[PDB]
């Protein structure tokens, strides 16, 4: 039994549990769509921009805990996706990007949108921000290369893949051989028994232990192991900003967010100098995770760092126990050992009204801009994985589009995106996509008529000497939503906002809420933060 190479690719994605392929067609890509529509299993989602498709696949992957897939044509289709894939790379999200390539017979002749070394070399452009970027050389190799891509994306530190597919091989016949995922990728690494024993001993004798949980908790699906571990030991848990929702913030052991826009309670605990044993789980300990590598984060007695990526361990802080292992496998081992032992509207008011009306199981997507500060600082995240923020690359527009992918991954749950107006101008056209497929997402646009953080930067770092941040005329997002077939509310009082949010939650359609916001409002942690840029200059 034979199938086209591209159908084999689609069938192998089927066995990984892939449900959607986000993208925009093109001539050389049409065999992929022909295969998808023939199989009636994976559903294609047409987006407005391939960057939006990459964002959506990234949002789908993070919420589903599965592989996200997007596709793009030769040349400018693929290059349009790059920012989204770079975000996936920075956030360790498994996203597979399928791109088309011209036929082999046209290499080096000036083919339309030629995407080889002789034209626009997509394989090379994507190499720095993917775990693997490769062109399928022959139809016979489609199988091996697809399994390689799927194994690479989801093994070790997860990350995106770029697979480039020449249009002439795509429909060549190949043996129909699909494998279950267990047969072509391996399991997760665990800690050694001696490392488990040594950590348990450090915990038993510690007089002021603490946990810093990062985004690796989501990557590892380690939420309930982390919660059980903390309750079993009494150890309080802080999270990184991106790590928000790894631990329930209404829990008695929750310190809140440590770092940028974080909570005084976490800062006091971890920088006091009193913590003797600090356990870092799944954080790369970059700038915003550490208040620019504050030396006071160093504990008194031992720093324990657990990471699946051995290159992150001991990078910025010397470690006393450095565990290279999956976070959930490490926490399980620790639990077992310890147990068997026996031993306009102010944005803060906006967030507050959201907290009072949003169901507990709401998945909140937050963009990049002042909404980082307001969401990270002012929103209480009780549900595991329910706070979705892209802080690895912090690309404007990420949350605007990724929330659509998130809703497709969790159709039973409310999905809300908190975004700025300039971010919405970058990728807000995608709400037309939500309208087209009736994907109920609510966008809350903090409409401050320009680039808030930039505006505040001009005031605090540049003496208000110039303005490259304020629009001379704010965008009317309700009219824009109307033009794209999405219901809208304008909110200028918190009462109007609450009525809009309550209408939007009930409606079963996409909806947009245009919130009037003062561009001069100083968001939490921003004041304390400008100095790093000043220090940099």
Ligand X SMILES: O=C(O)C(=O)Cc1ccc(O)cc1
Ligand Y SMILES: Cc1ncc(C[n+]2csc(CCOP(=O)(O)OP(=O)(O)O)c2C)c(N)n1
For residues 465 and 158, give the distance between their C-alpha atoms in angstroms, rounded to a whole number: 44
Report phi then psi at 413, rounded to 5: -115, 155
DSSP track, 445-477: EEE-SB-HHHHHHHHHHSTT---SSB-SS---H
Range 485-524, binding a second copy (CB under 8 A): 485
Compare residues 239 and 488 and give the one whose CB is closer to ligand ADP.
Answer: 239
CA distance linking residue 434 with residue 405, whole number of Å: 10
User: Pick from ligand Y, Mg ion, ligand X, none: which does 44 bind, CB < 5 to 8 A by kind?
Assistant: none
List the one residue from 45, 69, 308, 400 that touches ligand ADP (CB under 6 A): 308
Contact 402, 55 (CB under 8 A): yes
Does position 235 interact with a second copy (CB under 8 A)? The reply is no
Choose among 144, 103, 151: nearest CA to 8: 144
Nearby residues of 193 by Cβ (< 8 Å), 6 or more positions away: none
With binding defined as CB under 8 A, does residue 291 bind a second copy? no
Q: Which does 59 bind (CB under 5 to 8 A by kind): ligand Y, a second copy, ligand ADP, none?
A: none
Angle at 387 between CA 189 and CA 83, to 5 degrees: 80
Using the contact rule CB under 8 A, the part of the chain among 44-52, 272-280, 332-340, 493-501 near a second copy is 44-52
| In the complex, residue closest to ligand Y by CB | 420
Cβ-based neighbours of 259, under 8 Å, separated by 6 or more:
240, 241, 266, 288, 289, 290, 291
Interacting positions 147-206 with a second copy (CB under 8 A) = 167-168, 170-171
Nearer to ligand X, 76 or 156 (CB): 76
Is 195 near ligand ADP (CB under 6 A)? no
Angstrom distance (rounded) from CA 196 to CA 189: 13
CB-nearer residue toward Mg ion: 230 or 395: 395
Which residue of 28, 143, 166, 214 would you call a contact of ligand ADP, by CB under 6 A? 214
* Closest distance to ligand Y from the beta carbon of 344 (Å): 12
Binding stretches for ligand Y (CB under 6 A): 24-26, 73, 76-77, 80, 368-371, 394-396, 420-423, 446, 448, 451-454
CB-neighbour burial class of residue 290 (10 A; exposed 0-12, middle 13-18, buried 19+) = buried
147 vs 451, which CB is nearer to ligand Y? 451
Query: Considering CB distances under 5 to 8 angstroms, the limit depending on partner class, which of Mg ion, ligand X, ligand Y, none binds residue 30?
Result: ligand X
Q: What is the contact surface with ligand ADP in residues (CB under 6 A)?
A: 91-92, 157, 214-216, 219-220, 240, 242-243, 282-284, 286, 289, 306-309, 312, 326-327, 391-392
């Amino acid at each position: 039994k034979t199938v086209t190479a591209v159908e084999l690719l689609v069938r192998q994605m089927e066995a990984e549990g892939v449900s959607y392929v986000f993208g925009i067609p093109g001539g050389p890509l049409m065999p992929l769509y022909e295969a998808i529509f023939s199989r009636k299993k994976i559903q294609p989602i047409l987006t407005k921009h391939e960057e939006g498709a990459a964002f959506m696949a990234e949002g789908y992957a993070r919420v589903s805990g599965k592989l996200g897939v997007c596709c793009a044509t030769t040349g400018p289709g693929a290059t349009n996706a790059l920012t989204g894939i770079a975000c996936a790379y920075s956030d360790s999200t498994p996203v597979l990007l399928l791109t088309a390539q011209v036929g082999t017979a046209a290499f080096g002749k000036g083919a339309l949108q030629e995407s080889t070394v002789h034209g626009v070399d997509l394989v090379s452009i994507f190499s720095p921000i993917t775990k693997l970027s490769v062109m399928i050389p022959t139809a016979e190799k489609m199988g091996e290369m697809t399994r390689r891509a799927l194994r690479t994306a989801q093994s070790g530190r997860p990350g995106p893949i770029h697979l480039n597919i020449p249009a002439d091989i795509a429909k060549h016949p190949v043996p129909l051989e699909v494998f279950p995922p267990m047969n072509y990728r391996g399991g997760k690494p665990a800690p050694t028994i001696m490392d488990v024993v040594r950590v348990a001993e450090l915990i038993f004798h510690a007089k002021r232990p603490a946990i810093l949980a990062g985004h690796g908790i989501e990557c590892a699906k380690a939420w309930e192991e982390l919660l059980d571990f903390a309750e079993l030991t009494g150890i309080p848990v802080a999270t990184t900003p991106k790590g928000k929702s790894s631990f329930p913030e209404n829990h008695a052991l929750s310190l809140g967010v440590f770092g940028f826009a974080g909570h005084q309670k976490a800062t006091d605990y971890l920088l006091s100098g009193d913590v003797d044993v600090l356990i870092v789980i799944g954080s790369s300990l970059g700038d915003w995770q550490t208040n620019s590598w504050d030396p006071r984060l160093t504990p008194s007695v031992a720093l324990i760092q657990i990471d699946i990526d051995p290159m992150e361990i001991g990078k910025n802080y010397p470690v006393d126990v450095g565990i290279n292992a999956d976070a959930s496998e490490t926490l399980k081992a620790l639990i077992l050992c310890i147990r068997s032992s026996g031993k306009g509207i102010h944005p803060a008011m906006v967030v507050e009204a959201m907290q009072n009306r949003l169901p507990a199981d709401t998945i909140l997507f937050v963009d990049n801009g002042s909404c980082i500060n307001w969401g990270v600082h002012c929103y209480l995240a009780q549900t595991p994985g329910a706070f979705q923020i892209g802080l690895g690359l912090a690309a404007m527009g990420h949350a605007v589009a990724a929330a659509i992918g998130g809703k497709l991954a969790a159709p039973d749950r409310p999905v809300v995106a908190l975004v700025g107006d300039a971010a919405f101008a970058m990728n807000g056209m995608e709400i037309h996509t939500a309208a087209e497929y009736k994907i109920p997402v609510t966008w809350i646009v903090l409409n401050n008529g320009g680039h808030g953080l930039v505006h505040l930067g001009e005031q605090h770092q540049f003496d208000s000497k110039f303005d490259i941040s304020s629009f001379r005329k704010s965008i009317d997002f309700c009219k824009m939503a109307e033009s794209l077939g999405v219901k809208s509310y304008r909110a200028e009082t918190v009462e109007d906002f609450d009525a809009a949010l309550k209408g939007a939650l009930a409606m079963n359609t996409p909806c947009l809420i245009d919130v009037q916001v003062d561009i001069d409002v100083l968001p939490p942690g921003m004041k304390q933060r400008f100095d790093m840029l000043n220090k940099s200059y």
